[PDB]
């Protein structure tokens, strides 16, 4: 509703193409593409992107705000992108990368092997945290969720794969 | 930067029991703080606590400011009793005079962030009333 | 345990309580419970709800009750046929009156009143509503 | 997980949600808060 109300900005010289509901956006960073929900009308008038319902649709303004949020997300992605850093808290918790292949030494009989898509790459300035940047917010969040769900940590001390800005709620095992 | 005042009566040095390591939570010494407190309390009476504020800095050269003795013990000495009260609403303890309340107010007006003495005078009067030191 | 000192007779018919009721209005207290439907309030249930309301009010205010288990019902102890005469006296209840105030409260806020009456709904199988004393 | 009939909001910072037709309460302030009906 109020999300679709707000106007949508795009940079200058960014090749944004609309084909019905199929909206792709490409620039100096890269290309982000998806076909949008059918409950939305889209049109562009020389400086803006507007979202609204289609005639005879129940979830009209709601899905219009949805598509508004989606297109702003991919606009920011083609401008600079979104960054994530999967950080480990623990005694000797480390990892590595080979382009997009990851080893995990967190107490297994085989060090786990992980894979990332071509959209995400990782470097290792440190060996306890991995720095991996990209332009796909949902892809990098999926990578975060995957390397978190490999071994979801415990609630007692704070030992496992957590997030950069997260603070651990300490439930200490009562003696 | 770590503005926590935790001090005891100046009569006894090295307040290890009451706070102890609480004053030494950082890497600063526990003897220098006591020496500075004694140096500040040399020119005033001994046997009463004095609050001192602290902002510890890295160079092991602490900057501190002292304050007047607490108004709690001030009104304690004014009433001439050591214990405040037990269930104040039920029973009467002592009689507290407006003039001596005003004089207790004027001696700590310099410490307190109050310009008109009347407002903080009625403040301490209400404090005494709530404690059971009826005005 | 609300129960008569003496009754008119030891048993009585099972009885009927249909149609509309007469305990429509509030009589003694500020806050009450309505039961639109139909059922039965055991003496244990009535005493339990009274104790629970005392619990919630912390002995502030008063409690009131309108219906009484003055009718000692005869149910049949299990595994006995329809015959052998009427059954045996087993317990005491009162049945549910559409529009009746059952338990009453005063001296405590409306929020605590609805809380305690929902707790009456959670100590009784009967359908409820929150009522107060009517202006004339 | 919790199996009851009367599910209720737990504290000032939980969240009633609908997930596949059943009420779900979660509050990471208490890892216990994960309610359920059925």
């Amino acid at each position: 509703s109020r999300v679709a109300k707000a106007p949508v900005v795009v940079p200058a010289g960014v090749d944004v193409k609309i084909n019905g509901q199929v909206i792709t956006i490409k620039g100096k960073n890269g290309e982000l593409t998806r076909t949008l929900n059918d409950a939305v009308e889209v049109k562009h008038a020389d400086n803006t992107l507007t979202f609204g319902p289609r005639d005879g649709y129940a979830d009209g303004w709601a899905q219009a705000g949805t598509a508004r949020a989606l297109l702003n997300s991919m606009v920011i992605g083609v401008t600079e992108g979104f960054t994530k850093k999967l950080q480990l808290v623990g005694v000797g918790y480390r990892a590595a990368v080979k382009g997009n292949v990851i080893n995990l030494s967190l107490g297994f009989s085989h060090p786990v092997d992980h894979q990332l898509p071509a959209g995400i790459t990782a470097e290792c300035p440190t060996q306890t945290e991995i720095v991996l940047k990209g332009a796909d917010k949902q892809v990098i969040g999926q990578v975060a969720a995957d390397l978190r769900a490999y071994r979801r940590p415990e609630p007692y001390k704070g030992k496992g794969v957590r997030y950069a800005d997260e603070v651990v709620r300490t439930k200490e095992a009562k003696k | 930067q770590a503005y926590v005042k935790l001090q005891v009566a100046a009569g006894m040095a090295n307040p290890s029991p009451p706070v102890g390591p609480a004053l030494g939570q950082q890497g600063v010494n526990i003897m220098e703080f006591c020496k500075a407190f004694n140096a500040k309390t040399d020119s005033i009476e001994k046997g009463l606590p004095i609050p001192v504020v602290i902002t510890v800095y890295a160079d092991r050269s602490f900057t501190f400011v002292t304050k007047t003795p607490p108004a709690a013990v001030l009104l304690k000495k004014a009433a001439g009793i050591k214990s405040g009260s037990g269930k104040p609403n039920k029973d009467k303890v002592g009689k507290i005079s407006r003039a001596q309340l005003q004089e207790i107010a004027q001696t700590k007006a310099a410490d307190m962030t109050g310009a008109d003495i009347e407002a903080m005078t009625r403040s301490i009067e209400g404090t005494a009333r709530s404690m059971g030191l009826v005005v | 345990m609300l129960q008569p000192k003496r009754t008119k007779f030891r048993k009585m018919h099972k009885g009927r309580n249909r149609g509309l009721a007469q305990g429509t209005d509030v009589s003694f207290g500020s806050f009450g419970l309505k039961a639109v439907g139909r059922g039965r309030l055991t003496a244990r249930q009535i005493e339990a709800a009274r104790r629970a309301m005392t619990r919630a009010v912390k002995r502030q205010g008063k409690i009131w009750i309108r219906v009484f288990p003055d009718k000692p019902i005869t149910e049949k102890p299990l595994a006995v046929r329809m015959g052998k005469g009427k059954g045996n006296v087993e317990y005491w209840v009162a049945l549910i009156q559409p529009g009746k105030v059952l338990y009453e409260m005063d001296g405590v806020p409306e929020e605590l009143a609805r809380e305690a009456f929902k707790l009456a709904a959670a100590k009784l199988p009967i359908k409820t509503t929150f009522v107060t004393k009517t202006v004339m | 997980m919790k199996v009851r009939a009367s599910v209720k909001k737990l504290c000032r910072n939980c969240k009633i949600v609908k997930r596949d037709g059943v009420i779900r309460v979660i509050c990471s302030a208490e890892p216990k808060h994960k309610q359920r009906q059925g």
Partner: protein, 94 residues
């Protein structure tokens, strides 16, 4: 001071009451002293909201029935036994 739009109920009765309650109308009657008894059909939620006030059974209201103001006041009431419906509301002329 509430000015309420109400009409004259030609035929009364129990079946009439049931159909009027289906069609969102509940009755009331004008009386008082020596005057001729007339009875009216009221606007339900309007009356409920107006009598939710504390002054309904005290103040001198005004009734528009067949294009005329009538000054009446409360005397008595009947209510639905187990629902928020005022079975009857009573008027004494002012």
């Amino acid at each position: 001071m509430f000015t309420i739009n109400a009409e004259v109920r030609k035929e009364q009765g129990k079946g009439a009451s049931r159909r009027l309650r289906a069609a969102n109308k509940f009755p009331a009657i004008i009386y008082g002293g020596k005057e001729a008894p007339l009875a009216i059909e009221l606007d339900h939620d309007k009356v409920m909201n107006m009598q939710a006030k504390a002054e309904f059974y005290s103040e001198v209201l005004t009734i528009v029935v067949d294009g005329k103001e009538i000054k009446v006041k409360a005397q008595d009431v009947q209510r639905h036994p187990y629902k928020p419906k005022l079975q009857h509301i009573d008027f004494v002329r002012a």
